[PDB]
Design a protein around this ligand. Structure first.
Ligand SMILES: O=C(Nc1cccc(-c2nnn[nH]2)c1)c1cccc2nc[nH]c12
Length: 263
């Protein structure tokens, strides 16, 4: 079937010129709304959630892991390092790296998370351990954002990512302490106000992680507490046909608005 909401999302997609993927889980009733829910999209920096969560999982059996220092060398800096560049020739802890990756979208910090997990495949292994058979991380930053149409590397589907984000933030994929830390980090994101959150009523609250890459790829994944309602999990992924296309955070906002209006 095609619902009213799916029809509205299709119309948004058509006027955007790109390809839109949406997955909602409403934890009021566990129902789902999907649009291209089983198509693959480049994750870009939304993959930082999986990496940080995998390190949180490791910390369950090492109480001091998040206080562990990681050397930041001049050679480690990549293309977007607003936090790590302050610490070059010094150290950051794994908590600091997780917070920088999630809240500032620092790519050097993400690379240290990936290295802590033994490379991109360590992030995929954690996804499999928590029931996500779809997610794959194949490369480090910055090349994981190439976002080439048809390229399976560094992709997932909206359905899989929504289910994962639910399990991480609201369910029991992590220990209680760790889940609370992940939620705190997401709620403190600095980069999200133009994306999903711009489409929601202002009384609501949320935590999110954005991403962007080539092909005008513009992504956001969020856990949302609507006023007076059980929480939602929402993924909005968007990618465009030309390598040099401009980001379109407004499309994510519009998708979120359609979703919110359909509750
Ligand atoms: O690392 C990249 N982008 C990047 C770096 C750091 C953070 C983000 C980001 N976070 N939230 N939304 N975008 C995006 C990047 C790499 C290669 C080609 C790209 N074209 C656009 N961005 C690209």
């Amino acid at each position: 079937q095609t619902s009213a909401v799916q029809q509205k999302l299709a119309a948004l997609e058509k006027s955007s010129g790109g390809r839109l993927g949406v997955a909602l889980i409403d934890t009021a009733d566990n129902t789902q709304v999907l649009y291209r829910g089983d198509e693959r999209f480049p994750m870009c920096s939304t993959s930082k959630v999986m990496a940080a969560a995998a390190v949180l999982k490791q910390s369950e059996t090492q109480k001091q892991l998040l206080n562990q220092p990681v050397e930041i060398k001049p050679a480690d800096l990549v293309n977007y390092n607003p936090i790590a560049e302050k610490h070059v020739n010094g150290t950051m802890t794994l908590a600091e790296l997780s917070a920088a990756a999630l809240q500032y979208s620092d790519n050097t910090a993400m690379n240290k998370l990936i290295a802590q997990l033994g490379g991109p495949g360590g992030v995929t292994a954690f996804a499999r351990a928590i029931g996500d058979e779809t997610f794959r991380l194949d490369r480090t930053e910055p090349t994981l954002n190439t976002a080439i149409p048809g390229d399976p590397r560094d992709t997932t589907t909206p359905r899989a990512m929504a289910q994962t984000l639910r399990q991480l933030t609201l369910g029991h994929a992590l220990g209680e302490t760790q889940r609370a830390q992940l939620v705190t980090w997401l709620k403190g994101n600095t980069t999200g106000a133009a994306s999903i959150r711009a489409g929601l009523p202002t009384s609501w609250t949320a935590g999110d992680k954005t991403g962007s890459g080539d092909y005008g790829t513009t992504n956001d994944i969020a856990v949302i507490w609507p006023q007076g309602r059980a929480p939602l999990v929402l993924v909005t992924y968007f990618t465009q046909p030309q390598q040099n296309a401009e980001s379109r955070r407004d499309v994510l906002a519009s998708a979120a608005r359609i979703i919110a209006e359909g509750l």
